[PDB]
Amino acid sequence: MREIVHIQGGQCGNQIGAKFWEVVSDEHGIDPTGTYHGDSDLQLERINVYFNEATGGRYVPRAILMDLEPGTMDSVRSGPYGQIFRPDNFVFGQTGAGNNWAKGHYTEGAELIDSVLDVVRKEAESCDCLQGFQVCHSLGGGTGSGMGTLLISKIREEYPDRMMLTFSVVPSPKVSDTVVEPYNATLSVHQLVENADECMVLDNEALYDICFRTLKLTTPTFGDLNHLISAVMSGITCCLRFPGQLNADLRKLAVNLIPFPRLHFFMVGFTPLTSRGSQQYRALTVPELTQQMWDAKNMMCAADPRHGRYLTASALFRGRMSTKEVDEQMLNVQNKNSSYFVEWIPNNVKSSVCDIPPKGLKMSATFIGNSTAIQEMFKRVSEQFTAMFRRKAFLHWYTGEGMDEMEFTEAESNMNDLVSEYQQYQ
Amino acid sequence: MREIVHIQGGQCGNQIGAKFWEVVSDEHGIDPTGTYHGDSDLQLERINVYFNEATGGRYVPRAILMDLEPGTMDSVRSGPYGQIFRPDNFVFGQTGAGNNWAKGHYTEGAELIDSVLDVVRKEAESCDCLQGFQVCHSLGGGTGSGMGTLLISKIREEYPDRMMLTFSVVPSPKVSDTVVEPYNATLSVHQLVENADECMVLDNEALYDICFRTLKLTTPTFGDLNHLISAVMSGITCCLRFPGQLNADLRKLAVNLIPFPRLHFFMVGFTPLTSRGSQQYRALTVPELTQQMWDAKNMMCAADPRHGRYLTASALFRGRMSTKEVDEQMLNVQNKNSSYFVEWIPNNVKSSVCDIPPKGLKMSATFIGNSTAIQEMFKRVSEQFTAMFRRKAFLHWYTGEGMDEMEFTEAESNMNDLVSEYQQYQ
Amino acid sequence: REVISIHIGQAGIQVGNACWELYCLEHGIQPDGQMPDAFNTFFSETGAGKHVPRCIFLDLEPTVVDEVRTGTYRQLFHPEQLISGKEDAANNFARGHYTIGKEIVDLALDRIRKLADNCTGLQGFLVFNAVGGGTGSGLGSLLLERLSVDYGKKSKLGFTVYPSPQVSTAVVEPYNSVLSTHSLLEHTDVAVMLDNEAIYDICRRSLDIERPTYTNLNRLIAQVISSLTASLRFDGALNVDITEFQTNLVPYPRIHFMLSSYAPIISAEKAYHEQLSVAEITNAAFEPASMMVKCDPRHGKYMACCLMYRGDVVPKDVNASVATIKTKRTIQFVDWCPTGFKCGINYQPPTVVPGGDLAKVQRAVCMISNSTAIGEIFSRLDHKFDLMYAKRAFVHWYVGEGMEEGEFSEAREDLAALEKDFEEVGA
Amino acid sequence: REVISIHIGQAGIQVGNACWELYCLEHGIQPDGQMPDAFNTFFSETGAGKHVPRCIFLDLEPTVVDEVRTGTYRQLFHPEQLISGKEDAANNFARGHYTIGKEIVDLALDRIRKLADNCTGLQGFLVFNAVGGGTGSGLGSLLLERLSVDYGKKSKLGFTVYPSPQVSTAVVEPYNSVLSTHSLLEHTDVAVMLDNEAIYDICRRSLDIERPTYTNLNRLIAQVISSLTASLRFDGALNVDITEFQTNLVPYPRIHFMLSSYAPIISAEKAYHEQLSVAEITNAAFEPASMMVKCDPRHGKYMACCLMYRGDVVPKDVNASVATIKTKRTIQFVDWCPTGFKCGINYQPPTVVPGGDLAKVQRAVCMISNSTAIGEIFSRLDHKFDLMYAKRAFVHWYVGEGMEEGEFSEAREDLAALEKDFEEVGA
Amino acid sequence: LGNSNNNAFRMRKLFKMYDNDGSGRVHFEDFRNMAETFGMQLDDDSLMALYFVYDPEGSGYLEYEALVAQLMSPSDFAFYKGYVDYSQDKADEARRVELLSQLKKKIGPVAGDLERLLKAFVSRHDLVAGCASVGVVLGDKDFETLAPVMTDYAAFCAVFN
Amino acid sequence: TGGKFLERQKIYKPRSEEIYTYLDLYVGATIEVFNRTFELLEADEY
Ligand SMILES: Nc1nc2c(ncn2[C@@H]2O[C@H](COP(=O)(O)OP(=O)(O)OP(=O)(O)O)[C@@H](O)[C@H]2O)c(=O)[nH]1
Ligand SMILES: Nc1nc2c(ncn2[C@@H]2O[C@H](COP(=O)(O)OP(=O)(O)OP(=O)(O)O)[C@@H](O)[C@H]2O)c(=O)[nH]1
Ligand SMILES: Nc1nc2c(ncn2[C@@H]2O[C@H](COP(=O)(O)OP(=O)(O)O)[C@@H](O)[C@H]2O)c(=O)[nH]1
Ligand SMILES: Nc1nc2c(ncn2[C@@H]2O[C@H](COP(=O)(O)OP(=O)(O)O)[C@@H](O)[C@H]2O)c(=O)[nH]1
Ligand SMILES: [Mg+2]
Numbered sequence A, B: 001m002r003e004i005v006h007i008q009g010g011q012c013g014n015q016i017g018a019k020f021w022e023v024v025s026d027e028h029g030i031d032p033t034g035t036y037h038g039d040s041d042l043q044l045e046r047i048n049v050y051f052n053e054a055t056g057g058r059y060v061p062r063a064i065l066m067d068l069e070p071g072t073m074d075s076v077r078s079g080p081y082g083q084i085f086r087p088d089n090f091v092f093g094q095t096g097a098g099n100n101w102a103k104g105h106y107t108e109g110a111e112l113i114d115s116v117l118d119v120v121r122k123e124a125e126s127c128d129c130l131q132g133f134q135v136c137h138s139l140g141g142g143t144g145s146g147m148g149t150l151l152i153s154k155i156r157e158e159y160p161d162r163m164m165l166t167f168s169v170v171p172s173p174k175v176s177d178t179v180v181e182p183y184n185a186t187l188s189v190h191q192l193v194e195n196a197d198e199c200m201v202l203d204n205e206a207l208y209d210i211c212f213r214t215l216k217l218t219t220p221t222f223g224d225l226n227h228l229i230s231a232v233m234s235g236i237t238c239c240l241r242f243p244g245q246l247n248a249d250l251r252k253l254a255v256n257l258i259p260f261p262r263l264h265f266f267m268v269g270f271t272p273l274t275s276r277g278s279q280q281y282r283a284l285t286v287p288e289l290t291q292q293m294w295d296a297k298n299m300m301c302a303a304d305p306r307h308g309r310y311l312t313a314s315a316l317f318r319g320r321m322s323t324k325e326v327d328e329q330m331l332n333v334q335n336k337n338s339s340y341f342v343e344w345i346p347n348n349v350k351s352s353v354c355d356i357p358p359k360g361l362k363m364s365a366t367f368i369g370n371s372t373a374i375q376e377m378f379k380r381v382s383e384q385f386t387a388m389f390r391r392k393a394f395l396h397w398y399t400g401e402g403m404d405e406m407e408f409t410e411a412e413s414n415m416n417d418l419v420s421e422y423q424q425y426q
Numbered sequence C, D: 001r002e003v004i005s006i007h008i009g010q011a012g013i014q015v016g017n018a019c020w021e022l023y024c025l026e027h028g029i030q031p032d033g034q035m036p037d038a039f040n041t042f043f044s045e046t047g048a049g050k051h052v053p054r055c056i057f058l059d060l061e062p063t064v065v066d067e068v069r070t071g072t073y074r075q076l077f078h079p080e081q082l083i084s085g086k087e088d089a090a091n092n093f094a095r096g097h098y099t100i101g102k103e104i105v106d107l108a109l110d111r112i113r114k115l116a117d118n119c120t121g122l123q124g125f126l127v128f129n130a131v132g133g134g135t136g137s138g139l140g141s142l143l144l145e146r147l148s149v150d151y152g153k154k155s156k157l158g159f160t161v162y163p164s165p166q167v168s169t170a171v172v173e174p175y176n177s178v179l180s181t182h183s184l185l186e187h188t189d190v191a192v193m194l195d196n197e198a199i200y201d202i203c204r205r206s207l208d209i210e211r212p213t214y215t216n217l218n219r220l221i222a223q224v225i226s227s228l229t230a231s232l233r234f235d236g237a238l239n240v241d242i243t244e245f246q247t248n249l250v251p252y253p254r255i256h257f258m259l260s261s262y263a264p265i266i267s268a269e270k271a272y273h274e275q276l277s278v279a280e281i282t283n284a285a286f287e288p289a290s291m292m293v294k295c296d297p298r299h300g301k302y303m304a305c306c307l308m309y310r311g312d313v314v315p316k317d318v319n320a321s322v323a324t325i326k327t328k329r330t331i332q333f334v335d336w337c338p339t340g341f342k343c344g345i346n347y348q349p350p351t352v353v354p355g356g357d358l359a360k361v362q363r364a365v366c367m368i369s370n371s372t373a374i375g376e377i378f379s380r381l382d383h384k385f386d387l388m389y390a391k392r393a394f395v396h397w398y399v400g401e402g403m404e405e406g407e408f409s410e411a412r413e414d415l416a417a418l419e420k421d422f423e424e425v426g427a
Numbered sequence E: 001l002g003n004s005n006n007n008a009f010r011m012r013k014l015f016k017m018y019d020n021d022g023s024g025r026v027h028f029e030d031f032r033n034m035a036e037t038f039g040m041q042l043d044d045d046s047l048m049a050l051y052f053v054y055d056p057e058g059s060g061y062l063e064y065e066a067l068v069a070q071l072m073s074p075s076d077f078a079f080y081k082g083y084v085d086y087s088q089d090k091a092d093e094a095r096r097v098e099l100l101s102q103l104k105k106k107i108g109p110v111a112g113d114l115e116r117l118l119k120a121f122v123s124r125h126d127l128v129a130g131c132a133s134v135g136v137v138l139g140d141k142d143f144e145t146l147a148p149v150m151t152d153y154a155a156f157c158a159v160f161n
Numbered sequence F: 001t002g003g004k005f006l007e008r009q010k011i012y013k014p015r016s017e018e019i020y021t022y023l024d025l026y027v028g029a030t031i032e033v034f035n036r037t038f039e040l041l042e043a044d045e046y
């Protein structure tokens, strides 16, 4: 009844979405040939939220990829569950922007965005009453950011009344792949602050930290990190796909977590995440769950919440649990560490429960806390942006394409009023 | 209900804790695989005081081990019950202090105390109503003494209302491991005299002596020494873990043995301890236990109590025993040697009985004596400290790290005023 | 004698799922819908060999309602009363009162119209809702407005579930509560306040379940409602219908907020423990250890009280108990009511439910009183409402819907006016 | 008639464990809770075929409490009366009177309130406690404090266990005994003293047990309690209630420190070695070889005496024997009472317990006396209290709890006035 | 019997001093007298329950060695018994019992297949091959323990079954 | 995921006070060590 369409941008987004569609199809028992192989009928009644029954019980993921290099497409098709997509949604350019936000926003988008708008318009008209759109990308590359950026803008000006999620990985100086990361991220967030409904900030630095400490893997390939964030995305959409004793849809969570229309960046945590050796010496209870939830090392961003103040917080629980134990636990963690919470908003925790755990675990939880600690990371990247812009390094490749300086001045000013208003509300 | 956490510092701390966990695990019938296999349900009711149920009767000991050398940790996973610990509690550094109180108190504490304080905060707030904490450590080694010192101070400033036990071995000239024994022991007790609630003073000289005379073993490795002190620890905490005709907890043993808040050092004695050749020829009665408990050759410190006065004493009994004979034997020993007791304190004896004997035995006792004979050892230590400090031997390795001279003078002054007040109350 | 029950919100449907389950097992009706005259107040004998509830489930999201459609009472409840929306108000009174209400409440009205047509001797309606949510607040208030303009004279029982002060599930629930009170101020006739924290203390202390869920909560709520309606369901020695609650519990046309309590809340082994008589539960009904609202009646002054009794009770002991309560000074009444009690008794005992955590109890007491503890409760929520309102927090969602600052300001001062009324009657 | 018993401290609940065991086998009620009117003074008949004791065990160490719950009387003692804290006062009157008492005295007093509400003809409460410990002293005092502001005029029989002079289990028990008496003087109405070494002497001599545990102690003490409650559990030829202990045994409202004595304490082989009669037991109940408090009555002068009898007792031989006692000079009374005797006769002999050290006796005596020997005792306590008080030993624990030196000094001087008062009434 | 070096007699006073002769059999009235002289004070109704549980016959004579064991501590019961063998031979027989029990624990699970294999064949050397094939290590010391067991493959597996 | 599991010492038998010897180490065989039981899957060439 409520619908979500999926949009993946760039190589990172496509691999993330591939892992995402794999794990959700596992959650609903659909084999890589697209046929039903589950047992419980509870899996059946809520697959319309992500699928369309094509030909006699054949289910297609309601998704649209978009990128600029065929190597991405081949990596999508090589793996399992990579042949369940409809090839009409494989909308795809040919030349490539290559970590160039200007190219991904002005040259290639100018002839690619009309077509992708057609396929998303078709996929949106195919259903009845949209709930929201989902867009996965990063903020370092150009092809994922820039085109996904203009894609978000065109969707907003077309359908401004529907929910919208964007999962964006932000680059850090510790995990610093490309060189023009600030020139990309600043411009992208400069668009995200006026277009997207809300965003979920992700970072590879925190991913590497948690696979060191909590997971203790030796070789954390990209597949595991994508497995982590996909478990997060499955956790945030679990309320729509399964009934619970306290339901919280995407719109309900957004209206509960966003106090002011510019404050829509959230740091994410997910539990339980224990090493395979430590999985035996542990218990499964809600305080055990909560203590790993509120741990600062479990956050998926490089912003220490104890360095700032929590504005709001939200907890999504999976598994048949005791609601009385839930609120009293939330009551305690707000009463004990009372300084980390904001003063002029009481009861800063929203909590929800669903009676369906993920497969393989008896009970799980996702933490979405809106703190003011994120201004650190924004200041972290804006000082690099200013550092390069002081003497105009790497500027001419954007300049000679058609972009000019006032866009950058507008980006830094928007970042500056942004961070100053976090400090104001801090 | 009442909760006791364990803390181990140093190599000697780990091995003592390992054997101690062995004995109490066998006391509560749990196997080295972490499952219950006993018969009496009385074991089931008081296992929360040291364990937490993880998965289907999987009880992890509520303990935190701490060291700086991996071989210690390897030696911990060695014996029985080495794989019943949760490796997350295996909080552990990498550099190593190495018989350096300064390294154990200023440099390595700076990066280790955050982690251990984090895990003990988890291990404490996991349970509701703490009864107290436990600390086993040494006074000769660095990481045991120094880091345990910093730990005790930090937990006392955080949680001062909970009880706190400290079992420390003091180095002796007749059993002399290292050279910096006084420079460590004096500084550590200088912190103990204000931070620790109470302590049980141990010594290996008395252990070897007791083993040769009573046990008459011909190769007493460190193992049976750990077995002896474990029998002490089990005796001091059994009354909480088993109902009795008259019970006594950590707190009232403290309130009943502390007349003055600075005099919190006790000598210990465990009974019965007889060689298997002489096991066959001995009776099993309460005077038979009393004659060995009050014998000066059974104390576990290097201080003859008959050289001074008993300020107060206490005896914990295990096994179905008769109360009248208990208190009459206490009256007897009180009245026959009426010289060794302090004058202004009538009724210098506290006694409690628990109905559960230790496994393999029928009736036992442990002794906790608060006497002024201990200032013999302390004077014997301080004279070595001043012998070194007068001509500044080994001083540079301490001074060149951050420690200064007033730390030595405050330690000596605190040393001299405590032996003075011990001489005063003598 | 008939009365209709509607359920507005995620909480309402689950509560009704407990109530009607209790009712059919009370009247011996299997979930298929047929029996293998007292049902005539809740059930109409559809065709013959079938009974339909006089009920209307309504929500905006489909997940909970079609869970009922695939549940066990798929045939008992009939598939056209379960009105369902397409998307949630999502804790937004504006969206629930203006956006989606205008397309959904019309169908609700014209459905309950023909239900009232089928009815003959309509006593009233009763609505189930929690004012913390958006759906239970917004479209519920809009429905009550149109229901008042429809009938006006007939009693509408608002059994509301308030948010606890320290126990909270939502964030904007103060805003929702304020806006909803501004409408139920003048819409509902008789309205009963039920918190969640008192219920949590009840299941902790008396029922002694350490890890409870909403099922046991709604079980006791349904038992409260069944105890309140067994007077018209079955004949007793002293039965009282829905109409008299306006003349006995309502001294002022704006103060209609009753504190509910029940006794005895007794587990299976504790029935083996305690010898049940009436004096002890009569006391037990007044202490905060058995109330359904987290408040202190010791800080409050009682105005009017109702006491429904079920089972084997002779009136001599309830007169002796009220006499000893009146001469006891631990609870002080208001100086404007000399007699502030009203009793009632029905023969049939409240039954036990399969899997329910209650025992076979000989007699029971339902206490419905009024105090100024609500006068404290309103201040407690008004203040915390003013906190978030001082910096215009979360206001942009309602204005984005189309509301303004006027209704916030006027509801704030009106609730202020509610406080000055409470402080004036308390003296 | 009804009288309920609360037990304060580790010792008292073990006492109650013995008394109620003895009461149930006395009234033929199996440990399951039912028999296969006399019980009405101690048991309420819940439901049908279930009798619950009118008791409140309370302690701070739950181990012993849960041992009662897991013992053999799991179902008689219904699992809610046994109130338990989380951690002990630990031999500390300060921690017992201020630290945890403030959280447990409330729940205790509202539970006994509702218990009294079950009661109808309550004559009084009786407390069992040892003034040596911390829990029995501190919160026991605070309970007696709030119980005296609750009722006051009702009798609260305090059967206390004082530390022996030379036999000692603790060290700070003088401080605990002084501070407890500091409030026991104005709290308990009727207080009976029970030392332990005198019991040991009795079991050593009369019972010829060389290696006794506390069970035989509690067994005999329970037989004293049952002997002094046989007047309320049953009717006799010459009955006396609980209210008369204030009229006969307490001439001045502060000298209520009573010594109990029981006879014949006789083993089964001595039941055959001796042919029992009355006069030898009238003489046996007076000597310190049969009293329950280690003292010497030859150095003091008696104030008042209560003589209870159970079995086949004719008042003529008792009257003649008391005549010979009043003519005989080996015991001297005070010159302020010509008749310092009061007798009571009961038809029912005291029953034996399974494996009891006392045989089936035809006649038994429980003696409750008052003399100045307790004044020698308290002087013996005050001397050793001042011994440790001169150097300020163990004072910092109470100060660390939050107390001061004012209450210590005021306790010391209040007993100094107690000794002066005893030396004035002794002349 | 609290504490002395002569208390075992006062325990011997229970029955074994005053029973002139015979095995451990006591008449019911005599048992009542020997009990009430020690302070038990048993009622006859309760007394016959003891005879019901400890004598399911109309004999009325009672084996007190079985009853006094529960009345006594296992350490102090030996004093009343008077005789307890501490001999090296008795210890060695206990060792042989322990070894034989241990061997039975080893071969028990695979005792069934051993019968089929031995019938598929008996010499001792052949038993080693058979036992090593089925999966139990059979050694010379195992033979020294099993020497009093057999010498018969049939009764061999039977006693192991 | 994933060390020195057991540190070198003698290994007594489950109930009896008898130590495992080399006479009990064979492929397929199983050894009970500290209430655990290990099968010897493959052996070294040496
Ligand atoms: N007593 C009780 N109250 C409940 C239950 N479930 C939810 N609530 C209450 O309902 C309030 C929130 O409203 P919900 O009923 O959950 O949802 P809603 O009424 O549909 O409003 P929306 O969430 O915006 O759709 C919470 O504050 C809870 O107090 C329940 O099972 N039992
Ligand atoms: N007569 C008798 N006295 C006892 C018994 N048990 C303990 N006592 C006395 O009680 C005194 C100590 O108080 P306890 O009852 O043991 O313990 P408590 O009163 O709960 O106080 P805490 O130990 O601080 O918890 C001791 O000095 C004993 O003399 C008993 O079984 N019989
Ligand atoms: N989570 C995740 N991030 C990735 C992955 N591969 C690359 N990235 C991030 O993406 C950034 C580079 O973006 P890029 O791949 O050029 O974006 P694209 O070209 O549009 O796909 C780097 O900083 C990486 O941290 C992946 O497999 N998973
Ligand atoms: N009782 C006992 N004492 C020990 C043991 N191991 C070391 N010690 C004593 O501890 C002192 C040295 O401690 P050390 O190993 O340096 O502690 P660490 O460096 O902090 O781990 C020496 O005086 C030893 O006698 C042990 O296993 N048992
Ligand atoms: Mg809802």
Ligand SMILES: [Mg+2]
Pocket: B247, D009, D010, D011, D133, D134, D135
């Ligand atoms: Mg106690």
